């Protein structure tokens, strides 16, 4: 099937041989993420933008049918996005574009730990073109949610301050 | 109604600022209690968030140590690809740049 070997019987002797030798599209590729980190090129940051927008849309519409079991791969995929941005260190241009699209619709705790780390990596825009689009909603939920979301925003905006 | 609401908004902010400036800090009727009821409530709430904030600031340096390891590894893989790309730039300089078309036909 998939390298399922039959030398296991020989792998008595072949395990002795191991002991004898002892004695006598790009997010899930850390070795390739360094390439996109170094190329701020046009057809690759766009080949990648269109994948992120259509993965954060389709798999977030996936919430509207499960919202419980799909809420663990989306969390674990947004974690990979978050890690890729922490490494590559610039906010993916679909990470903000998904945020402005999905912040007004957003609740307080739906992937809060991931959404409010996405806000950290938002390409410094003007704070006159990003304030009404995003920060007018990170106040619409900031002032209506509990402390445990409140502390998760001034922390989110704390990391946003460093990343700006 | 947008304008008819903006006018009443400025009219109401005016009243609220003229009433806040009227509000002298009213500490004279403060509390007849010796304030132990409010004190040992406020320290107890402090006990409620101090365990609740040590539990968060312990995860803070947990994730900061984990990320220090992670970003040290990222910096290592970055200086490697930095020295490698610099030596590639220096080597590809005047090694493949010295390529003649007729020499390329002679190699063929």
């Amino acid at each position: 099937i998939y390298f399922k070997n039959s030398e296991n019987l020989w792998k008595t002797a072949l395990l002795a041989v191991k002991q004898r030798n002892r004695g006598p599209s790009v997010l899930n590729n850390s070795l390739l993420l360094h390439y996109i980190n170094c190329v701020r090129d046009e057809p690759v940051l766009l080949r990648f933008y269109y994948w992120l927008s259509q993965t954060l849309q389709e798999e977030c519409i996936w919430y509207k049918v499960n919202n419980y079991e799909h809420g663990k791969e989306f969390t674990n995929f947004l974690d990979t996005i978050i890690r890729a941005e922490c490494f590559l260190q610039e906010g993916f241009y679909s990470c903000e574009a998904f945020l402005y699209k999905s912040l007004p619709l957003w609740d307080g705790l739906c992937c809060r730990s991931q959404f409010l780390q996405l806000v950290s990596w938002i390409p410094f825009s003007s704070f006159s073109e990003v304030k009404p689009l995003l920060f007018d909603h990170l106040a619409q939920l900031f002032f209506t949610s509990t402390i445990y979301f409140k502390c998760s925003v001034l922390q989110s905006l704390k990391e946003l301050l460093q990343n700006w | 109604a947008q304008l008819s609401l903006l006018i009443m908004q400025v009219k109401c902010l005016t009243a609220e600022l003229s009433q806040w400036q009227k509000k002298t800090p009213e500490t004279i009727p403060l509390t007849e209690d010796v304030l132990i009821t409010l004190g040992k409530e406020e320290f107890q709430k402090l006990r409620q968030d101090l365990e609740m904030v040590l539990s968060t600031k312990e995860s803070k340096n947990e994730k900061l140590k984990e990320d220090l390891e992670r970003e040290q590894r990222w910096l290592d893989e970055q200086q490697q690809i930095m020295e490698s790309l610099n030596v590639l730039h220096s080597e590809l300089k005047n090694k493949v740049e010295t390529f003649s078309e007729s020499r390329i036909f002679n190699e063929l």
């Binding site: 809060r112 730990s113 445990y148 922390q155 | -």
Partner: peptide
């Protein structure tokens, strides 16, 4: 992180 943690004091 303190965001993944702040999502588990909301519950706990």
């Amino acid at each position: 992180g303190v965001l993944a943690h702040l999502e588990r004091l909301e519950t706990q």
